[PDB]
Amino acid sequence: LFRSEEMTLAQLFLQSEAAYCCVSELEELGKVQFRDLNPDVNVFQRKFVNEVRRCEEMDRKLRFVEKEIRKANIPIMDTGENPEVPFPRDMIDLEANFEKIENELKEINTNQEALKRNFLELTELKFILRKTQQFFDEMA
Amino acid sequence: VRKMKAIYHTLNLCNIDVTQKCLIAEVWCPVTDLDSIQFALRRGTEHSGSTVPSILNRMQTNQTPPTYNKTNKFTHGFQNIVDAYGIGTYREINPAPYTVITFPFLFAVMFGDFGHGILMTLFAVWMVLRESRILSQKNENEMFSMVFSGRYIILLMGLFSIYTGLIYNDCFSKSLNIFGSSWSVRPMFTIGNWTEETLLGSSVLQLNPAIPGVFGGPYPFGIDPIWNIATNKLTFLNSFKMKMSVILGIIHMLFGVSLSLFNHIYFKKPLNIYFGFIPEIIFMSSLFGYLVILIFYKWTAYDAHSSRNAPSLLIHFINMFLFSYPESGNAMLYSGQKGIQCFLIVVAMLCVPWMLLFKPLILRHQYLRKKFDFGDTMVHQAIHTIEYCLGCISNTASYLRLWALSLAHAQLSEVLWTMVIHIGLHVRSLAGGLGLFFIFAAFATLTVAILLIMEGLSAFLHALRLHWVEFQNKFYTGTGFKFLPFSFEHI
Amino acid sequence: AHSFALPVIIFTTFWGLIGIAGPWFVPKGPNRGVIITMLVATAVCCYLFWLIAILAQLNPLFGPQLKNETIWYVRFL
Amino acid sequence: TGLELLYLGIFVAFWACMIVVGICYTIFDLGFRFDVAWFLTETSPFMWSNLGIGLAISLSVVGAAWGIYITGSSIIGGGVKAPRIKTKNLVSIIFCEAVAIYGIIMAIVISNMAEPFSATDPKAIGHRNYHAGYSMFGAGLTVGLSNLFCGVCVGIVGSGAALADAQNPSLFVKILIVEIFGSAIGLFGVIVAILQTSRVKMG
Amino acid sequence: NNPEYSSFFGVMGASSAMVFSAMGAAYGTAKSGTGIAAMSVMRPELIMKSIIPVVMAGIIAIYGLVVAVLIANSLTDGITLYRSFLQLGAGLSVGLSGLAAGFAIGIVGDAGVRGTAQQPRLFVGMILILIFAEVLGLYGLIVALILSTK
Amino acid sequence: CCGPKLAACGIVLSAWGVIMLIMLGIFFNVHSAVLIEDVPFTEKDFENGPQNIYNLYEQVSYNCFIAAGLYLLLGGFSFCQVRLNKRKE
């Protein structure tokens, strides 16, 4: 009601491995801004840079798969239990393996597309041949 | 992967200590949710570790808090229209909830045509009744998304448009006669010797007769329908709308400035309260409340048979009392008015700008006696003072805008009626009504297109501008970071 | 020719009730601030608009031009 | 550039014809025929008054339009990379629009002093009327031209400041003074427009 | 005493009120159509999203038409030469106001159409600027209406 | 095609029409002095008396009722079409 809603700041103590679980739980709760404390990072001092790189690679793989699916005109209906659970570190490897199998299928599809390009060149040759069947009248 | 990326981004923002394996993260959380935050630690102390607490850090250096005050139900739509500026500045925020109705977004009609208000209310009510399936189903277009976000404001603005049409007594530019109409003609002509104009009035005095004899008495609710079916409608409506303009704008801007007094007493600062805003209110009152009181006095202290020598003179005193009125004037010079005018000019124009000066230097002297950049402080104060003193007049003039929309909408409705419906209703009933379906459908399409939406959108944004230039640019100033929790916005 | 004391009294009474009727709190549940501000603002604004219109209609300095050419028609009314 | 050539040709031809007809009139001892007094007298003051009103509002509105478009194009161009400027800069736009307002209210005041005549001859009937008509036409021209020119200046300055805001957002407050100076210059124009028609009787 | 050629001024007042507003609306429509055609080559879904500058030009033309219709309906044979100059002044004022409003509408509508093709978040802000254009033309209309009586 | 948008527009326009022409017909039956300019007038009726004015008022009112009648007719037709389209699936 009143337009004050005092915010105030706080410190969040953590642990080594407990930090991931606590942060995931808070993200599920989602009531904190987490103002940055280290400005001199520039990604180079991001500590978990490799995890961010893995996330970026997974995002690129997902984007490519989604673009291929949209080209295939396939719905993305995923209603139901959407926020299942924050991803644990160990299962990330299995998810990446499944995505790699999907990428292998996509690579097979790309090879098929190259073969289709060759077949389309053959079809263009066939059309030029169809024209040559009528050019015999022009030869006279 | 989005959750993992957010977690690792936060960890990057978080800091790592060398004394232990623990991590310290600065957290912006509400006071009410603090317990829930502890509950998160309760999850931490249960499965993964046991030493993950959280402690309120109550310091004063920086720590500019986010707003996070935008916590409300459907009425949050109002906030979005206010959220075009990003209030911030902690608890100073005093935006929509104080205004809501008296805001320039519910008097955002000034076009109430009874029927137009009922149409807007019907559309918004049907849409609110269907909001369940509307949100359940896919969106149509971004404009539809904006209308869906605004449905509540649309409906309540429709109600206020209905009320404004009722008080204006202009239903589709055609007035409504309820519980009498005042005025008459037989008393005006028989007593006034203007009789024997049955056909002579249709031959000699075309559009001539306009005289009040033994008459008077206003409509108990609104404006008499006789003013609508007359031809001096333009002049009387113009004067009435301009005077309503002045009174409404002055009271609105007065309320806007008055809110700043509470805004500042909350944030201590007695020097500004006793030196910066008292001059503003004093000047604003002495220059505009006088005009309002003069308008009311002119309205009340005269009668039909009281015009000075000339028959009507309309008003003749609204504008000749300008913002300076150097000398002479003559006309209306009721005793004491010259003295009151001179006193108001000297207290307002000569004194208020002069005392609005100084400010922190007054403390600086004491500071200089104890053992701040004077230049920037005084130049910023000077620019703010000139901006406000010119902006009082500028916003008083700019408050006149919505009334132009009012007049234009009234004329558009009247001309549309007289050009389509007046043509559609005539003699030879069979021929006059066989095609009435097409003409009336054209009427419906035109009323929807140019009046309901086009002019409706014009007023919709006009009133928002009146909000954001003078209404709310009086009590709250500044910007601040909005809320930003981990809501998993990615579905 | 309409009386003015009775309409102004009745409308002032009604708008005053709806304005100062918030101390009589119906919900006393949720926020309750937006609703009281809404009621007070609506009452004050509507009363101000109605009073402005009726005061403008009071004391008609100049009479309307009944230029309909149907003065003989309105004479019956 | 053909339009410019046509306009210059019309200008030079008309001015050459005017100077040659003036020299012919003064050479041929035919000065009495070239009567400016008869032109300013037999001409109806109503045309002067109404033309003054129309110009007073029209120049104001078209100068405001010049300003608003010359600043809106700048805003939309410079707001692609920084959407936040799409609304915050609007404080420099309303000026131009408010400048147009300085016309309509003005256009009322002069129009507040218009009366019919019911007279045709110019001898001793219309002297004060002549002065009133000419004075109000002059005031209308003054307000219209000054308001248009201040509107275009304010729009130019607002576009400049808006493009300045695209890089550092902290200089808008330091730069707000120029456009309010322009608006004050428009206020001077409106003030003298008020004073010119302050004491004039029409009838 | 009715002077001759009195209706001439009112007739050209109505003609100018119609014609100048028509020209302004036409210019706005042309500029905004060019902008829409330029933008539609890459964002086909955003065609009906920003067709509104065309309807804004239509609104300006509507203002011109209503002022012209009112002036023409106020026209009589025996104009006292005091009403005719009033009608002419109102017509010229509203006509040039509509011309300027159409000018601004066209230019800003083209700019905003290109911007909303490039940046989707810029549309609503453009709205404000664009709407102000109509207001200017609107002023002509109102300054005509008061000029229709006094 | 009888699209849902077309059927909805027809239904809402028909409802709009029926309510407005019914209220026009009522206001003509009472012969309110506001729509007098709208009502057709001939100079030969000025001296005849209010009886002729009321007669032509009744005639234009009856015109309005029959107009609302075919408005109700086409609204019912649109309702039938939309109901058939809905029940087809």
UniProtKB/Swiss-Prot annotation, chain B:
GO terms for biological process: regulation of macroautophagy; synaptic vesicle lumen acidification; vacuolar acidification. It is found in: Cytoplasmic vesicle, Clathrin-coated vesicle membrane; Cytoplasmic vesicle, Secretory vesicle, Synaptic vesicle membrane; Melanosome. The modification Phosphotyrosine is found at residue 68. Residues 131-145, 260-277, 471-491 are cytoplasmic. One of its GO terms (cellular component) is synaptic vesicle membrane. Keywords: Cytoplasmic vesicle, Hydrogen ion transport, Ion transport, Membrane, Phosphoprotein, Synapse, Transmembrane, Transmembrane helix, Transport. Residues 112-113, 176-239, 299-343, 411-431 are vacuolar. It is a multi-pass membrane protein. GO terms for molecular function: ATPase binding; proton-transporting ATPase activity, rotational mechanism. The modification Phosphothreonine is found at residue 64. Belongs to the V-ATPase 116 kDa subunit family. Subunit of the V0 complex of vacuolar(H+)-ATPase (V-ATPase), a multisubunit enzyme composed of a peripheral complex (V1) that hydrolyzes ATP and a membrane integral complex (V0) that translocates protons. V-ATPase is responsible for the acidification of various organelles, such as lysosomes, endosomes, the trans-Golgi network, and secretory granules, including synaptic vesicles. In certain cell types, can be exported to the plasma membrane, where it is involved in the acidification of the extracellular environment. Required for assembly and activity of the vacuolar ATPase. This is V-type proton ATPase 116 kDa subunit a 1. The gene is Atp6v0a1.
From Swiss-Prot, chain C:
Residues 27-33 are cytoplasmic. It comes from the Eukaryota. Pfam families: ATP_synt_H. The chain crosses the membrane at residues 6-26, 34-54. Glycans are attached at residue 68. It is found in: Membrane; Cytoplasmic vesicle, Clathrin-coated vesicle membrane; Cytoplasmic vesicle, Secretory vesicle, Synaptic vesicle membrane. GO terms for cellular component: clathrin-coated vesicle membrane; synaptic vesicle membrane; vacuolar proton-transporting V-type ATPase, V0 domain. Residues 1-5, 55-77 are lumenal. The keyword Transmembrane helix applies. InterPro entries: ATPase_V0-cplx_e1/e2_su, ATPase_V0-cplx_e1/e2_su_met. GO terms for molecular function: proton-transporting ATPase activity, rotational mechanism. Expressed in brain (at protein level). It is a multi-pass membrane protein. Keywords: Cytoplasmic vesicle, Glycoprotein, Hydrogen ion transport, Ion transport, Membrane, Synapse, Transmembrane, Transmembrane helix, Transport. GO terms for biological process: proton transmembrane transport; synaptic vesicle lumen acidification; transmembrane transport. Subunit of the V0 complex of vacuolar(H+)-ATPase (V-ATPase), a multisubunit enzyme composed of a peripheral complex (V1) that hydrolyzes ATP and a membrane integral complex (V0) that translocates protons. V-ATPase is responsible for acidifying and maintaining the pH of intracellular compartments and in some cell types, is targeted to the plasma membrane, where it is responsible for acidifying the extracellular environment. PANTHER family: V-TYPE PROTON ATPASE SUBUNIT E 2, VACUOLAR ATP SYNTHASE SUBUNIT H. Belongs to the V-ATPase e1/e2 subunit family. This is V-type proton ATPase subunit e 2. It comes from Rattus norvegicus (Rat).
From Swiss-Prot, chain E:
Residues 72-87, 148-150 are lumenal. PANTHER family: V-TYPE PROTON ATPASE PROTEOLIPID SUBUNIT (PTHR10263). Ubiquitinated by RNF182, leading to its degradation via the ubiquitin-proteasome pathway. SUPFAM superfamilies: F1F0 ATP synthase subunit C (SSF81333). Pfam families: ATP-synt_C. The keyword Coiled coil does not apply. Expressed in brain (at protein level). Proton-conducting pore forming subunit of the V0 complex of vacuolar(H+)-ATPase (V-ATPase), a multisubunit enzyme composed of a peripheral complex (V1) that hydrolyzes ATP and a membrane integral complex (V0) that translocates protons. V-ATPase is responsible for acidifying and maintaining the pH of intracellular compartments and in some cell types, is targeted to the plasma membrane, where it is responsible for acidifying the extracellular environment. GO terms for cellular component: clathrin-coated vesicle membrane; membrane; proton-transporting V-type ATPase complex; synaptic vesicle; synaptic vesicle membrane; vacuolar proton-transporting V-type ATPase, V0 domain. The keyword Transmembrane applies. It is found in: Cytoplasmic vesicle, Clathrin-coated vesicle membrane; Cytoplasmic vesicle, Secretory vesicle, Synaptic vesicle membrane. V-ATPase is a heteromultimeric enzyme made up of two complexes: the ATP-hydrolytic V1 complex and the proton translocation V0 complex. The V1 complex consists of three catalytic AB heterodimers that form a heterohexamer, three peripheral stalks each consisting of EG heterodimers, one central rotor including subunits D and F, and the regulatory subunits C and H. The proton translocation complex V0 consists of the proton transport subunit a, a ring of proteolipid subunits c9c'', rotary subunit d, subunits e and f, and the accessory subunits ATP6AP1/Ac45 and ATP6AP2/PRR. This is V-type proton ATPase 16 kDa proteolipid subunit c. Residues 29-50, 110-126 are cytoplasmic. The gene is Atp6v0c. Its main location: membrane. The record marks 134 as: Essential for proton translocation.
